[PDB]
Structures are given as structure tokens and as C-alpha cells.
Design a protein around this ligand. Structure first.
Ligand SMILES: Nc1ncnc2c1ncn2[C@@H]1O[C@H](COP(=O)(O)OP(=O)(O)OP(=O)(O)O)[C@@H](O)[C@H]1O
Ligand SMILES: Nc1ncnc2c1ncn2[C@@H]1O[C@H](COP(=O)(O)OP(=O)(O)OP(=O)(O)O)[C@@H](O)[C@H]1O
Ligand SMILES: CC(C)C[C@@H]1NC(=O)[C@H](C)N(C)C(=O)CNC(=O)/C(=C/c2ccccc2)N(C)C1=O
Lengths: 478, 51, 502, 72, 125
């Protein structure tokens, strides 16, 4: 009953297959190529239809390698989109783009398989409640309150601290939730995935004795794995998280590293898929491609998915189409600066470009709101007179402008913080700072009380009583 | 004499800072010029190939 | 769309000669449309993607584009004498190279063919060129140092076996002196070295290979060389052949090091290949697949688990930057792929500070995992003092707090600078590195002559390697900086100072 | 809300519908406008309509102009 | 533009009276041609205009002329896109006008309306 097709053309990962004149597969239907690569017969070459080219021929994209494939191989179509295992069988396991476990722990129970392509939840089935959650990070909790249940993006160039921030968030908030927390590597270092998995095992989160209760699920399509896999690993991770949100009605976490590589693999694929590119060589279906992925990550009346995503900006270009389109789906961004990173200010969060839709006097209260506003005002004054004080220097400013410069410097030092995941780089082990402590510390800085102590007393500490302890230690040590 | 010496050292520092600023500006401008030329020609050739 | 390549008249004549028959041209393809690094071959019906095809001239090809009626292949050389209408033969073998132990000491031309002039290389054929990288369960965290010999690297940017550390800088700022230092430092360690020269001039490769041969590093080194006049396909392929040759040893419980000289030149060759294939390019005309180009190559450098023999591959890619453009395309791509970088600065290099590491912008994500205990103990104070010098030199012309800062920057920074600079092709053992850091960063070299720091250090090094062999024994035995070695090094440096003063 | 209509077109909608939504809202408003009533319309993120139109034009192989945006 | 220009040609030539021809954005006359030019199969020129920008401008402009039997004083508004005074469309108009008059956004930003750039607006009289 299943269609049997012949491979007509092979162009890298994109191949088109000829089907019988009667029956052609629908779009996104999975296609199994039988395959023969110096072994008996692995059917591992799975594809999915992209476009029906006409004359009994459809064009697919391979989720595996296409080296060794011949023209005329038999292509069994599955008659349905790629379905992946869902539920408690995924907890404690590592997966592929295809739902195949790569942990060498055995096969997954594939009773419940739900397809990776679905429609987003309806408009009427959406949460409208606005909750934030503290993270332990001063600059995040102060200037960009992350919404509970909302998509949250981290933007940075190469080597500014996206993954250290993601891992600090995982250290702080992931062990507090009651729901599961799934992670999807959508193209990143396989070294990092292995390190995270070994950390999960040593922590006890992934218990080798009873995998069945772990409250985590790891999906990984890394920087290898041709762009068919790097484009749909995000979808299979999203499917696994949607099962826990919809069916079990849990509160899921969805940590994704580099949703930018999803877009990048989509453009790589679309180049050979025979489409005219957009301005920066991206695929013409870029915005709706991001929308089909991000509009499923929501909070319905059943459950919530709090997604924390890293977004690469290529060549440090925030105007690039891929981050420029991610910005629209996010609701709490956090931009990292190469300048702040090089100035030792870690995390390199750019305070003024990093916004949030929850910094409102009705959601976070009036005291938090006013302190954040005053911090951003002094930082904006500093950023304004930056070039004048770069050429001339501080000696030419007025008295109020010099006071604002000194206060802005103390603020940008009190923004940095030691991380638990970065104890190897900084030493001086990480600090968790609540929201009340951050608010009191910035009230103390801006109120002029802590105006006669060194700037270095605020650098890489938490909880401004530690800034005062460090200032006392520095003056007594001389 | 002390005021004029302070002015001399301040203007020496400002000349050096404007020198490094001029260098950084020239680098950023060369990058912008190459990127502008690249994007322009890529757009022209994209249109031509589309025809 | 209205025209095709096999649209030529003789093929249609043959087809009209007999319509329905039994056998087609199975391994026999007749070339047509020899273009620009591509050849659209009619025939080869049973050919596979990635298939090696052999031309009549002798040129090797890879079946890339398997269209409906013609297969388009990529030429692995200057396919000039490929006569149009000539035969092509499939080999049945996906792209692979002969790999063996008989490669150690030879020079190779991205096709495993010796440009050495010393005859052929025996082999038991293996190693598909595009091998898959190890998974998550296959590898392991890095835990043993890969010593480069350079004090600055081994102290502040420590590298372990299985880490991809990028060497990024301008032109003529080092990076090849650094690569060759790391290779010449592997004499005692049991480490195979691979060095891929992807776009260097032939004289640079000549100098490197003769330095290797003279200093004895060729008994454990292989050299894959694609000069500047090589076809773009060979410069595109050469690091993959290097990676396959190194993976041969890595998957046999042996540790390998591989150095891709000018990986940005492989990216430029790939850009040439893509623009000649008319693929729509991204920023600065790069294919957009260039990240995948570099990442599927760099993911092969791993530290395998105990089940896989614990073999390792260390990758030292090299990226040249244009006017120090850290935020360019290929630099940022390689930075987002690797595990830390080593920034060489043209300013410090031309100012005489010759190993020109920009330590404030160069990291290593392994750190103490890679370093031995002695190097941690002695390098903590060193990175602290250089951290202090970092702000002091940029900020203070004379000083703030002129008394201790002239006791800080002079005694520590400007003498540690002379401590860190190291001659060309002269690596240091780990005992000499630990001793040299200890002599400086504790505060023992605070009053020497700034031009006599180098002489004092080298002479004290020879003195301790003559009079105190038990120091080297207690360091190469437990790899820790005990108070015994500490105190005996103290009396040794006091003796050496009172000797050197007169 | 007793005096306003909402014309929603999320990001996971096809580019045809995002391209058409301002015109749907405009016809809706034009009804009341030609029924002697004062109307006010707000096209939030009109650049998104231009992007949806550019996608539709590139997929139709219409030749692109500045920044792949169609001439019209 | 050609319609209005023909109506002015008649008043200059047949009726022999001084005509006063005011034109709104002649940038639109050029960008309409650039809009249709891709569909007319023509290959794209510099940044996206038709390959016939200079001749399309020139035909209409040279038709505007005081012909020694009647005179046409022509006042034309030329939209400079993105304040790029070196954009091709205004660049090819400058050579056709007699007294150009550049308007500066820097003077409009402070209220020196008419925000006429004094050092940029040249004239041949
Ligand atoms: N909070 C921090 N404290 C100290 N050092 C940091 C911190 N964040 C980042 N770094 C330094 O920056 C380097 C790069 O960080 P990281 O790799 O986590 O981010 P990234 O490269 O931007 O993200 P990705 O790994 O996804 O590309 C690290 O080697 C680390 O030394
Ligand atoms: N540590 C050093 N001590 C003395 N001389 C050095 C040292 N490092 C490099 N040099 C000299 O500097 C020159 C450039 O060094 P190197 O060959 O390492 O750079 P490179 O990789 O060739 O740069 P490029 O390939 O872009 O030309 C060489 O001629 C070398 O002799
Ligand atoms: C470099 C060679 C030896 C391996 C290639 N394979 C790949 O590049 C990718 C990584 N894979 C695994 C594919 O299956 C698709 N094949 C190709 O893209 C290619 C691409 C290619 C590009 C340029 C010249 C030749 C081929 N192959 C057919 C491959 O065989």
C-alpha cells in the first residue's frame, strides 16, 4: 500500500525522487531510502518532502548523509510526517533529530509518537497572565525581568557568553521547577553536549539506575549532521516539550542553544532547494520559518513552556535578518556586548539594548520600576558623553556630569557577577543574588551613600554588602 | 607656567586619543566600504540572474 | 531550463538508433562540458554521490551533482588535458585515502600522493575522507596537558589533548612559528603530528619541512601541502585528508595533534568553488555553507572515551585576520566552532615582544583540567601579576601610587614581559617552564637589569639542569610543586644570582 | 472594545495572509467610512507586510530589487 | 509627466505664450519606470534602477525648453531618497536643471524653514 519511488537526482542533501504516476507523497511526508553503505542495508537515510516538482516527482531533504546514494534506489514513503517518541520514555535519554536514542541505553518505547509538524495553539487557548521569575543574575533581574511562560532570547557574537549564561540559568532555575526541562542542541559543539550530559549524570538528574524519572530530555543535532538534521532537531525537541505541556499539563522548560543555526541550516538547504535568496543570501521563507517554530512555543490553559534561547549574531551584526526576525518572537531579550566582554564585565549583557516586556510598574511594582529607570537614565547619560570623555577625558566635564560618570561606572561594575558555572575562569565562586538585594544595592549606589569607595569594590561581587566588605578589605590591605 | 604645562600634557593626551580614534574610524570605514561594494554587486548580479 | 548538457547531438543520435534495449552505460561515462573545476559527465548510471571517478588524462574526480541524465563531477587537479567526449571510469570506492604508519615522515599533496620525491607509501586502504565525528557517548572530557613549550601558552592558555584551540592573528604575526614550536615540542611525548599547509607559498613549506627534518620532528610528523598555485579543490580538500590521516592513529589509542595552517584559505578556496558553481553567496561572497565547511572538519578533533581506546586529536587551526578584524565572518565562525583562541597581535609582535599573545582576549575553556598541578600552583600568581600590568600599562603613564606601582609595574610587568618572550623554534620543557615562572612571579627577579633578564634566565636554566637533577626528577615524578623542590630551587637561584653578579 | 475590530495575523500564518491583512482591515474600515462614520485604522508592523510580500515575490521567481524587495 | 508636458508644449508653441510648468516629484516618473523595467525583461542597472535612467530622464527634460518663440519656466521637485544626494535619480537630474536648490534636513531639524541648504544650492544666474 506504501508508495515505492526511484531516486531521480542527488544534489548534496537535497534529492528529488520519482513516484508512480498515480500516487505522490504529501509535503513533509517522511521518505525512507533503503540505502547501502559498505554494510548490509541501513535504512538510516530519512528524508522529508519539500515541494511537488510535477511529472510524478517530489523533492525531499535528507536527514542523514547522501554520500553513497545511487540514482534509482527504492524510496518507501511513510505516508506521514516524521513522528518522534514522546512522554516519559524520553525522560533521561538523549535523542537524534529522528527520535533515535544516541545514549546507547537501549531502544525507546514508541507507543506514543507525535509528528514534529503541527499547527500552533489556537488564539483562544492562550495564557494572558504575566509572571516574572528571578534568576539570581543582577542585570537580568533588574533590567530585563524574564516572563514566566514566555520566549526569552540571548543575543551575542562568537565568544561573548551565551552558553555560560544559558548554563547559569540552568543552574539557577532548572532545578526549581516541578515540570520537566528539555534541552535541544540545534547546532553547537558536541563537546558541550557531552559535557552537559556528564554533568547531568554526576548531579543525579539523569540517574543511570532508574532513567524513567529524570525530568530532563536532551535532543542534539550538532555542528556536524548535514542541514537536514540541524533544521528539524528544533522541531523534534519542540514536539517533545509540547507533549508535556499539552498532555501531562506540566510547566516545561525549553532551553535551546542557537536557534540561529536552525535558520542557518534552513538557508543552506534552501540554496540547493532551488530558491531565489533574500538580501543577505538567506532563504525567502525566513520569517514564516521562524514563525512556524516560535509560535508553537506558548503557554495555553493546559500548561506553559518557558523557552530560553541563544541567538547568534553573525559578525556581530544585530541588523542581520536572522536575529532581526528572532527579536519579534521574543518577549525578553538580553544582548551581550563584545566591548563589555573584553572589558572583563561578565556577564557581557548590554544593559540599554537588553529590554523586557515585563519592566512595567504594574507587573514588577513601582520601586523596582523606578530603580531600573534611574539606572538606565544614568547609563544613557554615560553612553552619551562617552565619546567626549574618550577624546578629551573626565577633567572637562561639569561636577554633575563627573558625578554621573562615577555613578555609572559603579553601576556597570555592580552589574557583573561571579557564576557557579564560571568558577574555573574567574575563581571567587559564584553568587546568587535575589531581587530585593539587587534593588537595595542599586538604591544604595544611586542614592549617593556608597559614593566614597573604590569602583573595584563592586566588580565581580553579589549583594552590595559584599561590595562594602571588599572595599573595607582593600583599604585595610592597601 | 604650570597651567600651560598642564595644557600641553592634556593636549598631548588628546592628540594621541584622537589619533587612535582616527585609526579605529578608518578601519570601520574600510570595512563598511567593502561591505557596501559587496552587497551592491551581489544585488545587481542577483537581479541579472533572475532575469 | 530550455537547454541541458547532454543536449549534444551524438547522444540523441545514439538514443534514436535504438529506443528500447537492455544494458546502459554502467561504469562508462563520456565527458562533456569541461568547465571551471567541474565536468558534466554523461553516463555513469550506477554512480554514487561521493564516488571517485578516474579520467582518461589521469585526473581524479568526485561525483558531486548526480542530475537526471548527466553526473557533474569536481576535478581534483588542473584538468586541462581532459579531452571532451572522452571516457570516465567509476571506481566503486567512495572518496577515501590510503592510510598506514608508513606516512610518518613524508610530504603529501591532499591526495595521499607523495610530493616528497622519496617513492611510494605502502598501505592497507581505509579512511573515507569525510568520516563522521564522534558522538556524545563516544568522547570524554579533556584531562591531560598538550605542552607547546611556550611559557605563555602553557601558563595562561593551557591546551589539553582533545581541544580545538584557534591561532588567530594578522599576517606575519607568528602562528606558524607557534605551530612549529608546538610540533617540535612533541619529541618525548608519544604524539603524532599532522601539519596541513593549505595556501602557503611553496618556500614557506620548504622552510617548515627543512626545520622539521633538521630538528628531528619528522619521525612522528606527516605533512599535507597545497601551495598557492594548487587548484582550489585541492586546497579545499587538504584539511579533510589531514583529518582522516590523523583519525587513523586517533582511533588506534594513539594521541594526535593536527595543525591546519590558514584554514581561512580553505574557506576562500571553497568560496571560489561555490561562485564558480554559481551558488548564491552570503556576506562577503561566502557560500553560507562555510560554517558547515569548518565545523564538520573541526568536530573530528575529540578525546575519545575509555571504550574507544582513549585516543585524542588536538586541533590547532589558524585564521589570519585583516587589520585585526576579530568580528569578521570566518574569524567569528571559527571562534564559534573552537574551544578557545590565542590572539597574536601585530602591535606586540612588531614592538619586539615576539610571542605576541594578546592574553587579555585569548582564553582556553579547559584551563586547570589540562594543566598539571605544578603549573597551576606557579601560574596563579603569574596570571595575577600580568592582569595587574594589563590595566597599569594602558592607564598610568608614570603611576597612581607612584611608589608601589613602580614596585608593581617595573618589578612585575616589564620583567615578566622579558620572561615570556621566547626565541624562534626553541621550545621549553615543563620543568624549565615551572622554574622560569617561579623565578619571576614570586618576586625574585625584581632588581635585575632589564636587558639582563633573558641572560640570567637562560643561564639559571642551564645551571638547574646541571646541578639539580633531583628537582627535575621530583617534578617529572609527581608533577606537583612541592616545598622540597621549591626550597631547593630557592637556594639554586640564590647560588646562580651570586655567581652571575661577578 | 465596543467600537473596535481586531484583525490578527500571527507570524506562523502564510505570507499571503500577512500580506493581505492590512487590505482586509482597510476594506473593513472603508465600509464605515462610506457609511458617514469616522474610522481610525492602525497597521502595526507594516514592514512585516513588506517582508511577507517579498517572500511571496521571491517564491514566484519575480525578479528582486533593492534588498530582494520587489520593485513595487 | 508626458501628458502635462504635452499640454505645456502646446501653450508654448501654438499659442506662443510664456508657460509656467510646475512639476511634483519627478522622482516618481523615474521610479515608475524602474518598477516596470524588471517585468519588461530589462536587466537591473546600478542599485536597482532601469538601465535607461539617463535617457528616460533626458527625453522628458530636453522636451522642456524655451524654444525662442515661447518660453517654459519649469519648477520641479526632485525627491532625494534617504537623503542620498548622490543617488542615481537625483544625480541624473542635477545635470538637466539650471538653478538647483538643495534642502537640508539639518536646517529643517532646527526650524530654518525654508530649509534651503545655502552652500549646496547653486545657480547659473
Ligand atoms: N560569566 C562569565 N564569567 C567569566 N568568563 C566568561 C563568562 N561568560 C563567558 N566567559 C568567557 O567567554 C568565553 C566564551 O563563552 P561561551 O562559549 O560560553 O559563549 P559563546 O561562545 O558566546 O556561546 P557559544 O558557546 O554558544 O558559542 C568563555 O571561554 C569564557 O572564558
Ligand atoms: N618567537 C619568535 N622569535 C623570533 N622570530 C620570530 C618568532 N616568531 C616569528 N618570528 C619571525 O617572524 C616572521 C613571521 O613569523 P611566522 O612565520 O610565524 O608568521 P606567518 O604565519 O608566516 O605569517 P603569514 O603566514 O601570514 O606570513 C618569521 O620570519 C619568523 O622568523
Ligand atoms: C568532501 C567529500 C570527500 C565528501 C562530500 N560530503 C559532504 O560534503 C557532506 C558532509 N555529506 C556528508 C553529504 O552526504 C552530501 N555530500 C556532499 O555534499 C558532497 C559535496 C562535494 C562538494 C564539493 C566537491 C565534492 C563533493 N559530496 C558528494 C561528498 O562526497
Amino acid at each position: 500500500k506504501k508508495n515505492l519511488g526511484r531516486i531521480a537526482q542527488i544534489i548534496g542533501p537535497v534529492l528529488d525522487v520519482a513516484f508512480p504516476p498515480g500516487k505522490m507523497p504529501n509535503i513533509y511526508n517522511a521518505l525512507i531510502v533503503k540505502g547501502r553503505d559498505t554494510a548490509g542495508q541501513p535504512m538510516n537515510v530519512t528524508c522529508e518532502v519539500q515541494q511537488l516538482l510535477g511529472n510524478n516527482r517530489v523533492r525531499a531533504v535528507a536527514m542523514s548523509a547522501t554520500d553513497g546514494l545511487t540514482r534509482g534506489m527504492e524510496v518507501i514513503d511513510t505516508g506521514a510526517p516524521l513522528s518522534v517518541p514522546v512522554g516519559g520514555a524520553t525522560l533521561g535519554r538523549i535523542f537524534n533529530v529522528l527520535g533515535e536514542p544516541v545514549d546507547n541505553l537501549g531502544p525507546v518505547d514508541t507507543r506514543t509518537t507525535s509528528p514534529i509538524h503541527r499547527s500552533a495553539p489556537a488564539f483562544t487557548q492562550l495564557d494572558t497572565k504575566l509572571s516574572i521569575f528571578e534568576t539570581g543574575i543582577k542585570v537580568v533581574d533588574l533590567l530585563a525581568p524574564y516572563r514566566r511562560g514566555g520566549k526569552i532570547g540571548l543575543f551575542g557574537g562568537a565568544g561573548v557568553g551565551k552558553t555560560v549564561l544559558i548554563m547559569e540559568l540552568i543552574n539557577n532555575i532548572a532545578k526549581a521547577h516541578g515540570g520537566v526541562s528539555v534541552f535541544g542542541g540545534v547546532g553547537e559543539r558536541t563537546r558541550e553536549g557531552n559535557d552537559l550530559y556528564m554533568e547531568m549524570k554526576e548531579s543525579g538528574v539523569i540517574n543511570e539506575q532508574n532513567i524513567a524519572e529524570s525530568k530532563v530530555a536532551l535532543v542534539y543535532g550538532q555542528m556536524n549532521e548535514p542541514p537536514g538534521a540541524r533544521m528539524r532537531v528544533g522541531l523534534t525537541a519542540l514536539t517533545m516539550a509540547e507533549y508535556f505541556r499539552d498532555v501531562n499539563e506540566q510547566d516545561v522548560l525549553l532551553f535551546i542553544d542557537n536557534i540561529f543555526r536552525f535558520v542557518q541550516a534552513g538557508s543552506e538547504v534552501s540554496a540547493l532547494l532551488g530558491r531565489m535568496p533574500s538580501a543577505v543570501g538567506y532563504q525567502p521563507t525566513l520569517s514564516t520559518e521562524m514563525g512556524s517554530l516560535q509560535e508553537r512555543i506558548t503557554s495555553t490553559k493546559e500548561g506553559s513552556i518557558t523557552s530560553i534561547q541563544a541567538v547568534y549574531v553573525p559578525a556581530d551584526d544585530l541588523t542581520d535578518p536572522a536575529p532581526a526576525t528572532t527579536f519579534a518572537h521574543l518577549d525578553a531579550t538580553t544582548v551581550l556586548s563584545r566591548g563589555l566582554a573584553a572589558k572583563g564585565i561578565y556577564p557581557a549583557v548590554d544593559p540599554l539594548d537588553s529590554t523586557s516586556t515585563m519592566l512595567q510598574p504594574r507587573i514588577v511594582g513601582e520601586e523596582h520600576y523606578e530603580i531600573a529607570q534611574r539606572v538606565k537614565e544614568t547609563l544613557q547619560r554615560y553612553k552619551e558623553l562617552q565619546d567626549i570623555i574618550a577624546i578629551l577625558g573626565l577633567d572637562e566635564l561639569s561636577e554633575e556630569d563627573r558625578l554621573t560618570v562615577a555613578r555609572a561606572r559603579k553601576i556597570e561594575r555592580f552589574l557583573s557577577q561571579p557564576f557557579f558555572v564560571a568558577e574555573v575562569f574567574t575563581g571567587s565562586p559564584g553568587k546568587y543574588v535575589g531581587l530585593a538585594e539587587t534593588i537595595r544595592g542599586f538604591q544604595l549606589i544611586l542614592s549617593g551613600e556608597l559614593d566614597s569607595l573604590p569602583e573595584q569594590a563592586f566588580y565581580l561581587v553579589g549583594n552590595i554588602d559584599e561590595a562594602t566588605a571588599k572595599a573595607m578589605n582593600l583599604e585595610m590591605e592597601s | 607656567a604650570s597651567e600651560l604645562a598642564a595644557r600641553m600634557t592634556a593636549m598631548s593626551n588628546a592628540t594621541d586619543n584622537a589619533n587612535e580614534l582616527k585609526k579605529t574610524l578608518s578601519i570601520n570605514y574600510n570595512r563598511a566600504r567593502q561591505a557596501k561594494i559587496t552587497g551592491e554587486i551581489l544585488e545587481i548580479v542577483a537581479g541579472a540572474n533572475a532575469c | 531550463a530550455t537547454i541541458r548538457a547532454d543536449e549534444i547531438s551524438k547522444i540523441i543520435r545514439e538514443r534514436i538508433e535504438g529506443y528500447n534495449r537492455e544494458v546502459k552505460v554502467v561504469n562508462t561515462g563520456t565527458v562533456l562540458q569541461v568547465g571551471d573545476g567541474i565536468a558534466r559527465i554523461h553516463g555513469l548510471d550506477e554512480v554514487m554521490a561521493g564516488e571517485l571517478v578516474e579520467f582518461e588524462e589521469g585526473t581524479i574526480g568526485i561525483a558531486l551533482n548526480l542530475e537526471s541524465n548527466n553526473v557533474g563531477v569536481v576535478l581534483m587537479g588542473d584538468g586541462l588535458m581532459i579531452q571532451e567526449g572522452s571516457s570516465v571510469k567509476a571506481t566503486g570506492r567512495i572518496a577515501q585515502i590510503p592510510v598506514s604508519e608508513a606516512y610518518l615522515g613524508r610530504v603529501i599533496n591532499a591526495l595521499a600522493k607523495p610530493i616528497d620525491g622519496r617513492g611510494e607509501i605502502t598501505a592497507s586502504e581505509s579512511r573515507l575522507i569525510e568520516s563522521p565525528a564522534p558522538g556524545i557517548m563516544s568522547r570524554r572530557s579533556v584531562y591531560e596537558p598538550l605542552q607547546t613549550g611556550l611559557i605563555a601558552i602553557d601558563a595562561m592558555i593551557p591546551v589539553g589533548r582533545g581541544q580545538r584551540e584557534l591561532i588567530i592573528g594578522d599576517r606575519q604575526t607568528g602562528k606558524t612559528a607557534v605551530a612549529t614550536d608546538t610540533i617540535l615540542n612533541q619529541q618525548g611525548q608519544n604524539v603524532i603530528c599532522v601539519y596541513v599547509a593549505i595556501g602557503q607559498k611553496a618556500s614557506s613549506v620548504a622552510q617548515v619541512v627543512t626545520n622539521f627534518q633538521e630538528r628531528g620532528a619528522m619521525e612522528y610528523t606527516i605533512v599535507v601541502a597545497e601551495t598557492a598555485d594548487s587548484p582550489a579543490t585541492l586546497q579545499y580538500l587538504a584539511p579533510y585528508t589531514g583529518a582522516a590521516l590523523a583519525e587513523y592513529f586517533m582511533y588506534r589509542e594513539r594521541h594526535t595533534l593536527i595543525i591546519y595552517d590558514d584554514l581561512s584559505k580553505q574557506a576562500q578556496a571553497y568560496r571560489q568553488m561555490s561562485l564558480l558553481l554559481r551558488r548564491p553567496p552570503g556576506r562577503e561572497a561566502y557560500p553560507g555553507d562555510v560554517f558547515y565547511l569548518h565545523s564538520r572538519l573541526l568536530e573530528r578533533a575529540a578525546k575519545l572515551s575509555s571504550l574507544l581506546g582513549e585516543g585524542s586529536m588536538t586541533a590547532l587551526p589558524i585564521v589570519e585576520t585583516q587589520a585585526g578584524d576579530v568580528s569578521a565572518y570566518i574569524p567569528t565562525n571559527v571562534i564559534s566552532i573552537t574551544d578557545g583562541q590565542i590572539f597574536l597581535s601585530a602591535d606586540l609582535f612588531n614592538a619586539g615582544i615576539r610571542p605576541a599573545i594578546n592574553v587579555g582576549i585569548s582564553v582556553s575553556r579547559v584551563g586547570s583540567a589540562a594543566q598539571i598541578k605544578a603549573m597551576k600552583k606557579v601560574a596563579g600568581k603569574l596570571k595575577l601579576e600580568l592582569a595587574q600590568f594589563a590595566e597599569l600599562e594602558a592607564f598610568a603613564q608614570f603611576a597612581s601610587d607612584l611608589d608601589k606601582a613602580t614596585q608593581n609595574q617595573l618589578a612585575r610587568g616589564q620583567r615578566l614581559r622579558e620572561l615570556l618572550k621566547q626565541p624562534q623554534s626553541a621550545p621549553l620543557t615543563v620543568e624549565e617552564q615551572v622554574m622560569t615562572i617561579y623565578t619571576g612571579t614570586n618576586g625574585y627577579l625584581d632588581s635585575l637589569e632589564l636587558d639582563q633578564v633573558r641572560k640570567y634566565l637562560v643561564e639559571l636554566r642551564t645551571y638547574v639542569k646541571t646541578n639539580k637533577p633531583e628537582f627535575q626528577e621530583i617534578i617529572s615524578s609527581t608533577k606537583t610543586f612541592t616545598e622540597e623542590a621549591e626550597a631547593l630551587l630557592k637556594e639554586a637561584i640564590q647560588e646562580q644570582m651570586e655567581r652571575f653578579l661577578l
